[PDB]
């Protein structure tokens, strides 16, 4: 049996401009087993948009998930990715930083 902790990156498709339609991406990589929960949060609430996701696999017991939704950045809204996985003792929340 093998288990690997997901690496989590949160980033927009295009440079963020308040307040212009864009896409917010989570790339959750290198994890095992495949059981996982991934959501984008807006001010702590699951994003009120259609989710897109794409799962792939490496032969070295590794899964890769690209997850995204539409979003319109603003100054006051904070976004985050929330991941839960058996390797995590609590859900992991990774903030979006448009300057990161």
Numbering used by the authors: 0 to 99
Sentences from the paper on this structure:
Beta-2 microglobulin (β2m) is a 99-residue protein, physiologically acting as the light chain of the major histocompatibility complex (MHC) class I. β2m displays a classic immunoglobulin fold, and is well conserved among vertebrates. β2m tertiary structure consists of a seven-stranded beta-sandwich; according to standard nomenclature, β-strands are named from A to G, and loops are named after the neighbouring β-strands. The mutant protein is the etiological agent of a previously unknown systemic amyloidosis, whereby patients carrying the D76N mutation accumulate large mutant β2m amyloid deposits, especially in internal organs.
Upon D38N mutation, the interaction with R81 is lost, while H-bonding is maintained with R45. Contrary to the D53N, D59N and D98N mutants, the structure of the D38N mutant displays evident conformational changes relative to wt β2m and the other D-to-N variants. The β2m region surrounding the D38N mutation site undergoes significant conformational changes, leading to rearrangements in both the CC’D-loop and the C-terminal tail. The analysis of D38N Bz-score distribution shows a pattern similar to the D76N variant: the EF-loop (hosting N76 in the pathologic mutant), is more rigid than in all other variants, while the CC’D-loop (as in D76N) and the C-terminal tail show higher flexibility. Although this mutant is the most destabilised (ΔTm of—3.4°C), the Tm drop is much lower than in the case of the D76N variant (ΔTm of—10.4°C) and, importantly, D38N does not display increased aggregation propensity.
